[PDB]
């Protein structure tokens with residue numbers, strides 16, 4: 001039976017398992033440290049390709065709304081130019097499930113060479129990106145069916161980036177709320 | 192207690208409830224019809240703003256990989272120009288949780304005027320977009336905490352678009368698999 | 383003397399020379415043929431990276447407004463997935479000054495393998511892209527100063543894409559004017 | 574006679590006149606001041622829609638390569654969220670030929686309210702954007718034919734942004750050259 005109802009049920013369970021297995025690997029003390037490192041960055045570059053780039057863009061819009069200076073761009077050659085322009089104290093959040101896309105590895109190498117802090121969000125595998133990162137947060141898609149592998153992967157990745165966002169709101173709550181209110185007031189003027 | 196572990200646990204449950212409540216509203220017979228309508232479209236425009244635009248882009252990349260001709264662009268004025276260029280038999284997938292963003296409503300009005308079929312992916316509310324759509328698929332975020340409302344909304348929206356994608360693969364399985372293989376072979380050449 | 387007034391004067395002359403030298407190479411009979419080929423394409427993919435991707439996007443928005451079904455995306459891995467999904471009769475407009483960016487060459491190889499027609503917009507050099515293209519339109523930046531090389535290159539590239547756009551309007555003038563009017567009416571509703 | 578050769582000749586002359594008429598309005602002392610203001614900005618937001626957004630993106634990529642922290646995004650609601658997050662000393666470069674697109678005016682109002690410096694790049698008309706800007710740089714398309722109005726407008730706009738870029742390179746030449754070299758070395762590794 002391959003009805004749409006069966007497909008939906010199996011996909012929801014697949015996503016639940018990705019959330020659970022990703023959450024199970026978190027070191028919460030290490031996560032609080034990473035959040036503090038991000039909060040101090042004068043500039044944050046979020047890198048990625050394909051589905052990882054969309055996860056990165058999703059995080060980037062939220063961070064920009066609450067006042068962070070963020071670079072996040074799909075063009076891989078532009079991404080490389082930003083990575084080499086990073087400074088000590090800046091942060092790169094490198095989102096790559098495989099950790100082995102040449103463009104993203106190159107951006108991480110360039111960021112690290114400039115003295116920036118590299119935080120990888122990547123699968124539980126021994127990848128070039130994991131070897132370059134100062135800190136790694138793990139994303140586990142679980143055992144997925146081929147038609148939905150990319151969707152459960154994205155679900156797992158968003159569980160990590162979403163938690164980073166909430167942690168950053170927690171650290172600067174008053175200003176975050178002020179910026180959320182100003183943003184809502186502005187977009188309502190476009191109704 | 193507002194520790195990161197508590198936050199992660201509550202957020203995962205919030206997402207689970209969004210998946211469940213969205214799934215509970217599906218009319219599977221109506222969904223199969225919508226999938227067939229999409230499969231026949233010579234051109235598909237996926238519209239949206241903000242987080243909905245990212246959900247749309249996520250679907251657009253998958254549909255393009257399996258051979259669909261898709262327009263999906265963030266610039267709202269460009270979106271309007273595409274909507275008025277649609278033809279009878281083309282499909283607009285209008286993604287808007289509120290269903291009341293002026294730009295997205297305008298695009299749906301323009302598409303409908305040209306004779307295109309409008310499928311709305313929207314919250315369970317009485318919005319201008321829902322009144323313009325030929326078919327509506329409901330997305331329910333559930334009762335969310337303010338720090339994560341947009342994330343659970345996105346989770347609910349992706350549950351609908353992901354199901355559309357799997358349904359479309361199901362309808363043209365051989366060609367979808369061929370295109371997935373060619374795509375994987377090409378990107379591996381960029382390693 | 384390196385005053386801003388001197389810089390502006392020299393840059394305008396550099397752009398004038400790029401327009402002139404690019405125009406001087408055009409075979410107008412071959413250009414009319416290319417325009418006809420584009421006009422018949424059920425789907426057009428415009429590829430490119432960096433500055434060439436922006437030139438491509440600029441053309442893509444105009445073509446979409448006048449009714450063409452166009453793919454144009456910065457992410458190089460997404461571009462590859464679109465190229466392998468092209469069909470016989472579809473057209474790829476491959477914009478690359480060097481003609482030797484691996485990602486763009488790969489997209490042209492994939493498009494040609496599927497039977498699509500490849501039109502390269504590229505410098506007057508013996509590049510892999512020029513060897514893969516069914517038709518090539520030349521772009522000459524001229525001898526440029528290092529601070530403005532990319533700007534005069536873009537000027538030369540836009541001179542070719544702009545001419546393609548005008549030629550396509552010429553071929554379907556009534557419908558183009560109708561679509562321009564509908565588009566203007568819609569965007570004015572967002573004032 | 575409406576041959577492609579005649580069209581190309583007329584379009585090149587139209588672009589030459591746009592460059593000339595835009596250049597003729599520059600106050601070079603005021604321009605040097607604007608360049609200095611930009612050079613000191615901890616964060617720069619470049620706003621715009623449609624063709625102006627592409628001009629902005631073109632400038633943004635160059636500024637990011639030479640070390641500036643820049644926001645530049647097509648989604649108008651995201652643009653609004655960035656504008657309200659700007660700080661005193663930050664700069665908004667608001668690119669709008671008409672100066673009367675509601676979204677761009679709103680972003681300029683929000684930036685000014687936060688204490689940021691607003692530099693408008695706009696036509697020689699009495700627009701809401703010109704009334705909000707601390708400094709305005711004029712862009713003149715000249716008298717254009719309807720098929721090419723947007724192209725000559727873009728040419729005029731790029732003449733201003735290109736001059737800003739060269740002026741900024743001039744102010745920090747050693748670091749700009751270092752960043753250009755690192756960027757070229759990195760992208761060559763992707764060949």
Ligand SMILES: CC(=O)N[C@@H]1[C@@H](O[C@H](C)C(=O)O)[C@H](O)[C@@H](COP(=O)(O)O)O[C@H]1O
Nearest residue numbers: 049050051052096097098150374375378459
């Ligand atoms: C054809 C292919 O395989 N494209 C992949 C992307 O997969 C997408 C979801 C897909 O399957 O259509 C992947 O998101 C991206 C980043 O991958 P990663 O850095 O997250 O490991 O790389 C690309 O080559």
Ligand SMILES: CC(=O)N[C@@H]1[C@@H](O[C@H](C)C(=O)O)[C@H](O)[C@@H](COP(=O)(O)O)O[C@H]1O
Nearest residue numbers: 183184187240241242243287288289341650
């Ligand atoms: C400041 C604001 O409210 N921006 C909203 C977007 O919310 C985002 C996630 C946010 O909160 O930062 C919303 O995704 C978009 C489409 O909304 P919708 O069409 O899905 O209802 O509209 C925008 O105005």
Ligand SMILES: CC(=O)N[C@@H]1[C@@H](O[C@H](C)C(=O)O)[C@H](O)[C@@H](COP(=O)(O)O)O[C@H]1O
Nearest residue numbers: 077431432433434478479480532756757760
């Ligand atoms: C650091 C570098 O060199 N980036 C280049 C891009 O140059 C841009 C304008 C630049 O200088 O910052 C180039 O537009 C793109 C496509 O090049 P092409 O396909 O048009 O030849 O390739 C990228 O690697």
Ligand SMILES: CC(=O)N[C@@H]1[C@@H](O[C@H](C)C(=O)O)[C@H](O)[C@@H](COP(=O)(O)O)O[C@H]1O
Nearest residue numbers: 268565566569622623624625669670671723
């Ligand atoms: C249908 C329409 O008119 N779209 C316009 C855009 O024109 C484009 C080039 C076009 O004609 O297709 C314009 O670039 C943008 C910003 O305009 P501006 O802020 O530079 O004045 O506004 C949009 O509404």
